[PDB]
RNA sequence: CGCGACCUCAGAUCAGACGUGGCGACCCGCUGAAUUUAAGCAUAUUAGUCAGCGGAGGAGAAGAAACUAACCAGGAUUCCCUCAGUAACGGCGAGUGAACAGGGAAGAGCCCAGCGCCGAAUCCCCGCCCCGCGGCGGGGCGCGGGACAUGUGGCGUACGG
RNA sequence: CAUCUAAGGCUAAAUACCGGCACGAGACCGAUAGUCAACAAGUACCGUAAGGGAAAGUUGAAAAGAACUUUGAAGAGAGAG
RNA sequence: CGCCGCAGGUGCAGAUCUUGGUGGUAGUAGCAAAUAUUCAAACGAGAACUUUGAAGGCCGAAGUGGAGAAGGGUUCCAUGU
RNA sequence: CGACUCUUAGCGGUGGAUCACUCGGCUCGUGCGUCGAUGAAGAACGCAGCUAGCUGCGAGAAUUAAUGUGAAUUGCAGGACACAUUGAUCAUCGACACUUCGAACGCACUUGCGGCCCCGGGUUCCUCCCGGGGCUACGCCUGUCUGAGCGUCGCU
């Protein structure tokens, strides 16, 4: 909702931040082990749990 | 782990044994069964001075 | 109707984010965390559960103060000194 | 007595402890006074207490305690057991004299069932099956 | 063979410290033989390897006589980079070959204060060794 | 279900014995922390016995043991009063005290105090301060010819 | 070029506070530059300019810190941050004056009796 | 009829200290089932066990006999072997079940209260000076304050003093 | 007759240790096995919550990871390396 | 890996077995609740679905309109693929 | 003849068995056996030039100092660094520092609101506003100060 509280909104700033590809550089990385990011969260597919 | 893994022999057998063992390496033919390449062995029972 | 349509009536929460422990299950109208049962002092542990128990227990997340602790133990917590300097 | 607390009265399960009423708590109120009197006072040891008086529905005991961090008692030997960190609420280990009592120990015949230093200890051994490497 | 009860011989625990080494101790690892000319001159069996001392490779495919110059340790990929020990790839450009130090002699090393007491002070251990063996 | 003969078994393995079984595995450990300890031990009374104070001679109390003697706690004090030794100085100089055990006939005190009486003359007493010797023993007496002594002290034969 | 804490140590107070001020300005300018797009160069001082406000902070810190340490050297009563910080356990424990007195009885205990040193003949 | 002394209580963001909470494999105090077995089941068994509550330490608990014995007597506690699947308990059914002696591992003993005697000889805190910092102490000084005769300290504790 | 001296207190060693720190080893398992977890695993995800809870190792010695040409808008191909 | 011994978590078609993969069914059922689309142009390799314009219609103010609460948490808005 | 179906073989797919490997376990053993109001365990949120996770850290934030070592870190960049008028990196770590919750401590929280004592600024020191610092929990011991009582008394 619009209204939210503090608390709740810094939850949802850390959440909004996570939410981002990984850097393509990282691949070349020696011993990268790194694809894709996994977690990966879309709003429409898997709610937080807050 | 409580499968009983160690087994107590009678004293007397384990001697028994190693009077067999001993007894036995002492015959040529035994021991060149064993393969041991004693052919240039000038004794069987080989014993060397307290030098070494 | 029990089903689906019950399911449409669902919008206020039960429970929140608990200041301790960080979990949702501080419930919003019993004032109690129902997993660590955060206004009481001391925290909420069973023996009933020991995957719960390990989930939470020391040295699952940070040990700031002992991993310094399992460092200082090994030369006796000395204090007030510092190596020759050069 | 001490009444089970369950509710209603009604204890599931077989008739051999379907007993509400007339049981007896394993520690006497005098273990109880100790405990109350160093719960309240954490930061004190408790020593000992004794009987001052009592009427039908109370007991009164004086708990003697010990500050274990006051300099007159870390400047005395002979009292600095006290203020050794094993030493902390004996009361409610069942350390102190009243506390002890309930445990059945003691030496000789009568007192068969804390050889080892406890009823838990002793039966912790008699049921401990000894499996050597050499059986 | 090994009769410290507290050295292991685990090889999956001796092939974690090596491949988990910090820094510091990847250095040591990462060492090079002296030529016989240098072994003569110092009293030392191996040094190791420095960024810029010339060296010549002696197993693989760039086997010869030709001293290049160190040019890069890469200790987080356990290889040293040399002068002319390069390939060229696709594109038309030249990367250098990554080769063990073991691979490679020193023959000129890269001498400086602390080079020179880390060569002293194993010449006086070694020194300490033949005369107690004698 | 019994089947033909045999015996009328009753194990006791109704009562969850899965959860407190006792492994011997550390056994082998055992004996050698044992036997470091022990050899510590040794070392850190030089001179004096390894195994410990004197033991005096005692009769298995049952009748089935009473034709063997072994070695009990200690002294007893009136055994200790005859052959002329404190009761407070006795275990300075390697002497067990047992206050509780009394005499009832005087064979055996008689056995105990002519022990003592040889052990007290068997005894070397290194003086307090080496430099100055005042009552304890010839300096030829103890210069090697006190040695520490393994097993235990006169031991009780039958 | 760069900052040491080394030679940092013979300063006051006072240019010590000015140095940290002057570094907190071209912090404040390069961080400026990153969001106006900037230059490598300008991007890699960043790290080495609040490295070196952590230097300059940490000496102001640890000059503070013994000076404190040596005024209240040998008072009885110490602020908590200064006391010994072993272990809470380790404070509780009685200290070395009374942990080694005796009562007057043990002391003639001892002082009679004492544990001598004895061997036994073979 | 105000001022003192004591007693019993109260306040304080008073000076200096202490406790709380965590881990909990091992340990201590309590509380404490039912599944199961009995070819059913209710005593019994599971089991003083799971779950529950509290409290510790590197170990803990125990521990120097209101003991064992019945002998030609042993001698704190704890652990190992054995006694012993025994004496005994038990719808005497299913099942349960130690201890003494013996051999070992280790081995170590002591302190009060009281009864007395000693001009309270005792203790804490606050100052100041000096020697020290390492687990804050020593020495000295104080017509400095308090605790304490409703009892501190020294000798002394069943082995007698 | 024997034996002890209750209703106060302390006390090391031998003993215990599936948690913790650091080690050593194995007639054990060898990626559906072995810890749930060899890997960004108590993670992803599920549930209002208590709680439930995986899948997932391997290019090659060295990226030398396919320059360049060509058809296609590109995926994708044909040559070349 | 053979031979002499040793020790097993030692032999699979079944368990409505566990896990994983794969078929026939099968180019099959189906993509049928709320009247409805059509013409030209643009971009584009590509147009029944995008966009613009021209029509014909529907919601018909208790709306398929304009805003909020709870809930979601960046879905908002530009540009590009 | 073709099509289709079946069988077998080659080649090609789909799938990931088998085998070989193993910075992982499991088991046994050894030595230590150390948390916290001087703020623990746990949580939250931040911190990298490019950084989403894991890891590390705490506004000094993928780290400062000191010591040992002795030339790298590295995916790209950039920049020191005579390595001796002292040194990259790593290791150690005894100095310093250590955001908010949390036993959690001024009151209270799915929010927020106080009180006292100093300092600085607007004031032009007196008390209004703004900033900064230090305090403000409960239980309890010793002592202190202030006290209460038709409690027991003494003198008046
Ligand atoms: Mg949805
Ligand atoms: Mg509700
Ligand atoms: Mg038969
Ligand atoms: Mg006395
Ligand atoms: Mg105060
Ligand atoms: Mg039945
Ligand atoms: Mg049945
Ligand atoms: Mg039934
Ligand atoms: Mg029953
Ligand atoms: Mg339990
Ligand atoms: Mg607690
Ligand atoms: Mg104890
Ligand atoms: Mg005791
Ligand atoms: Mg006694
Ligand atoms: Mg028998
Ligand atoms: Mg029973
Ligand atoms: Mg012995
Ligand atoms: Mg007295
Ligand atoms: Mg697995
Ligand atoms: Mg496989
Ligand atoms: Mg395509
Ligand atoms: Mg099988
Ligand atoms: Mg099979
Ligand atoms: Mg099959
Ligand atoms: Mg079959
Ligand atoms: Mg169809
Ligand atoms: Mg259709
Ligand atoms: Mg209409
Ligand atoms: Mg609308
Ligand atoms: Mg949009
Ligand atoms: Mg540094
Ligand atoms: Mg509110
Ligand atoms: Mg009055
Ligand atoms: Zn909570």
């Given at each position: 909702s619009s209204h939210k509280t503090f608390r709740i909104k810094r939850f949802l700033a850390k959440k909004q931040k996570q939410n981002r590809p990984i850097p393509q550089?990282?691949?070349?990385?020696?011993?990268?082990?790194?694809?894709?990011?996994?977690?990966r969260r879309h709003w429409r597919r898997t709610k937080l749990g807050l | 782990t409580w499968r009983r893994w160690h087994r107590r022999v009678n004293t007397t057998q384990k001697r028994y044994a190693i009077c067999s063992a001993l007894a036995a390496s002492a015959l040529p033919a035994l021991v060149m069964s064993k393969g041991?390449?004693?052919?240039?062995?000038?004794?069987?029972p080989l014993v060397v001075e307290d030098k070494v | 109707t029990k089903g689906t349509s019950s399911?449409?009536?669902?919008?206020?929460?039960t429970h929140t984010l608990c200041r301790?422990?960080?979990?949702?299950?501080?419930?919003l109208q019993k004032?109690?965390?129902?997993?660590?049962?955060?206004?009481?002092?001391?925290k909420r542990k069973y023996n009933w559960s020991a995957k719960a128990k390990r989930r939470n227990?020391?040295?699952?997340?940070?040990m700031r103060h002992l991993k310094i602790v399992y460092r200082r133990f090994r030369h006796g917590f000395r204090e007030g000194t510092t190596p020759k300097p050069k | 007595g001490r009444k089970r607390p369950v509710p209603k009265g009604?204890?599931?399960?077989?008739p051999v402890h379907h007993?509400?009423?007339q049981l007896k708590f394993a520690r006497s109120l005098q273990s109880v006074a100790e405990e109350r009197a160093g719960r309240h006072c954490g930061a004190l040891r408790v020593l000992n207490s004794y009987w001052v008086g009592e009427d039908s529905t109370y007991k009164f005991f004086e708990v003697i305690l010990i500050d274990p961090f006051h300099k007159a008692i870390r400047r005395?030997?002979?009292?600095?057991?006290?203020?050794?960190?094993?030493?902390?609420?004996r009361e409610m280990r069942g350390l102190t004299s009243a506390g002890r009592?309930?445990?059945?120990?003691?030496?000789?015949?009568?007192?068969?069932?804390?050889?080892?230093?406890?009823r838990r200890a002793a039966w912790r051994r008699r049921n401990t099956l000894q499996l050597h490497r050499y059986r | 063979m090994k009769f410290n009860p507290f050295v292991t011989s685990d090889r999956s625990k001796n092939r974690k410290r090596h491949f988990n080494a910090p820094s510091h101790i990847r250095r040591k690892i990462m060492s090079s033989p002296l030529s016989k000319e240098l072994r003569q001159k110092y009293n030392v069996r191996s040094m190791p390897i420095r960024k810029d001392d010339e060296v010549q490779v002696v197993?693989?495919?760039?086997?010869?006589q030709q001293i290049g110059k160190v040019v890069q340790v890469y200790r987080k990929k356990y290889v040293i980079y040399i002068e002319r020990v390069q390939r060229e790839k696709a594109n038309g450009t030249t990367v250098h070959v990554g080769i063990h130090p073991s691979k490679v002699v020193i023959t000129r090393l890269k001498l400086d204060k602390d080079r020179k007491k880390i060569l002293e002070r194993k010449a006086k251990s070694r020194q300490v060794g033949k005369e107690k063996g004698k | 279900a019994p089947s033909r003969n045999g015996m009328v078994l009753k194990p006791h393995?109704?009562?969850?014995?899965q959860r407190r079984v006792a492994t011997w595995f550390n056994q082998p450990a055992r004996k050698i922390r044992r036997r470091k300890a022990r050899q510590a031990k040794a070392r850190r009374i030089?001179?004096?016995?390894?195994?410990?104070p004197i033991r005096p001679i005692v009769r298995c109390p049952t009748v089935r043991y009473h034709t063997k003697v072994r070695a009990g706690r200690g002294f007893s004090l009136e055994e200790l009063r005859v052959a002329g030794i404190h009761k407070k100085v006795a275990r300075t100089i390697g002497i067990s005290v047992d206050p509780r055990r009394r005499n009832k006939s005087t064979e055996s005190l008689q056995a105990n105090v002519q022990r003592l009486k040889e052990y007290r003359s068997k005894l070397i007493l290194f003086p307090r301060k080496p430099s100055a010797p005042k009552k304890g023993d010839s300096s030829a007496e103890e210069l090697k010819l006190a040695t520490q002594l393994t097993g235990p002290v006169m031991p009780v034969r039958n | 070029a760069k900052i040491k804490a080394r030679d940092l140590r013979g300063k006051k107070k006072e240019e010590l506070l000015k140095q940290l001020d002057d570094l907190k300005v071209e912090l404040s300018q390069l961080r400026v530059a990153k969001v106006t797009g900037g230059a490598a160069s300008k991007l890699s001082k960043i790290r080495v300019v609040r490295k070196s406000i952590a230097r300059v902070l940490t000496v102001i810190n640890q000059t503070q810190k013994e000076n404190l340490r040596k005024f209240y050297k040998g008072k009885k009563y110490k602020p908590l941050d200064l006391?010994?910080?072993?272990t809470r356990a380790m404070r509780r424990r009685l200290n070395k004056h009374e942990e080694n007195l005796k009562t007057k009885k043990q002391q003639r205990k001892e002082r009679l009796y004492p544990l001598r040193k004895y061997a036994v003949k073979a």
């Amino acid at each position: 909702s619009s209204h939210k509280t503090f608390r709740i909104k810094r939850f949802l700033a850390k959440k909004q931040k996570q939410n981002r590809p990984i850097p393509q550089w990282i691949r070349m990385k020696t011993g990268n082990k790194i694809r894709y990011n996994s977690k990966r969260r879309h709003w429409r597919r898997t709610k937080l749990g807050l | 782990t409580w499968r009983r893994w160690h087994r107590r022999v009678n004293t007397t057998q384990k001697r028994y044994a190693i009077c067999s063992a001993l007894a036995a390496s002492a015959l040529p033919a035994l021991v060149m069964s064993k393969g041991h390449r004693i052919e240039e062995v000038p004794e069987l029972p080989l014993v060397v001075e307290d030098k070494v | 109707t029990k089903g689906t349509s019950s399911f449409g009536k669902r919008r206020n929460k039960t429970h929140t984010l608990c200041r301790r422990c960080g979990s949702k299950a501080y419930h919003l109208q019993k004032s109690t965390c129902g997993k660590c049962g955060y206004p009481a002092k001391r925290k909420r542990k069973y023996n009933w559960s020991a995957k719960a128990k390990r989930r939470n227990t020391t040295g699952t997340g940070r040990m700031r103060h002992l991993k310094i602790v399992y460092r200082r133990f090994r030369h006796g917590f000395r204090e007030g000194t510092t190596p020759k300097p050069k | 007595g001490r009444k089970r607390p369950v509710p209603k009265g009604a204890t599931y399960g077989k008739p051999v402890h379907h007993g509400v009423n007339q049981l007896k708590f394993a520690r006497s109120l005098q273990s109880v006074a100790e405990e109350r009197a160093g719960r309240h006072c954490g930061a004190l040891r408790v020593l000992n207490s004794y009987w001052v008086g009592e009427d039908s529905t109370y007991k009164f005991f004086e708990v003697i305690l010990i500050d274990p961090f006051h300099k007159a008692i870390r400047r005395n030997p002979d009292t600095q057991w006290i203020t050794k960190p094993v030493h902390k609420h004996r009361e409610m280990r069942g350390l102190t004299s009243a506390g002890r009592k309930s445990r059945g120990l003691g030496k000789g015949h009568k007192f068969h069932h804390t050889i080892g230093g406890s009823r838990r200890a002793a039966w912790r051994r008699r049921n401990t099956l000894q499996l050597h490497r050499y059986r | 063979m090994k009769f410290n009860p507290f050295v292991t011989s685990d090889r999956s625990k001796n092939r974690k410290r090596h491949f988990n080494a910090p820094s510091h101790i990847r250095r040591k690892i990462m060492s090079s033989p002296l030529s016989k000319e240098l072994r003569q001159k110092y009293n030392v069996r191996s040094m190791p390897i420095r960024k810029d001392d010339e060296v010549q490779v002696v197993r693989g495919h760039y086997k010869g006589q030709q001293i290049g110059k160190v040019v890069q340790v890469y200790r987080k990929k356990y290889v040293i980079y040399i002068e002319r020990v390069q390939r060229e790839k696709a594109n038309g450009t030249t990367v250098h070959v990554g080769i063990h130090p073991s691979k490679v002699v020193i023959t000129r090393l890269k001498l400086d204060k602390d080079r020179k007491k880390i060569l002293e002070r194993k010449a006086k251990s070694r020194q300490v060794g033949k005369e107690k063996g004698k | 279900a019994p089947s033909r003969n045999g015996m009328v078994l009753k194990p006791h393995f109704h009562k969850d014995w899965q959860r407190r079984v006792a492994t011997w595995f550390n056994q082998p450990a055992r004996k050698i922390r044992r036997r470091k300890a022990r050899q510590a031990k040794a070392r850190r009374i030089a001179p004096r016995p390894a195994s410990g104070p004197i033991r005096p001679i005692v009769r298995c109390p049952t009748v089935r043991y009473h034709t063997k003697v072994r070695a009990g706690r200690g002294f007893s004090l009136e055994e200790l009063r005859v052959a002329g030794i404190h009761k407070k100085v006795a275990r300075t100089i390697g002497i067990s005290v047992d206050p509780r055990r009394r005499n009832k006939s005087t064979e055996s005190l008689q056995a105990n105090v002519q022990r003592l009486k040889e052990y007290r003359s068997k005894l070397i007493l290194f003086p307090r301060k080496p430099s100055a010797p005042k009552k304890g023993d010839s300096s030829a007496e103890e210069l090697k010819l006190a040695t520490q002594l393994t097993g235990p002290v006169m031991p009780v034969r039958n | 070029a760069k900052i040491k804490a080394r030679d940092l140590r013979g300063k006051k107070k006072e240019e010590l506070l000015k140095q940290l001020d002057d570094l907190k300005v071209e912090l404040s300018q390069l961080r400026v530059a990153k969001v106006t797009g900037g230059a490598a160069s300008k991007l890699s001082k960043i790290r080495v300019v609040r490295k070196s406000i952590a230097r300059v902070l940490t000496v102001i810190n640890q000059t503070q810190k013994e000076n404190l340490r040596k005024f209240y050297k040998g008072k009885k009563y110490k602020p908590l941050d200064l006391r010994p910080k072993k272990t809470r356990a380790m404070r509780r424990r009685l200290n070395k004056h009374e942990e080694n007195l005796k009562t007057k009885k043990q002391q003639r205990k001892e002082r009679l009796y004492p544990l001598r040193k004895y061997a036994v003949k073979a």
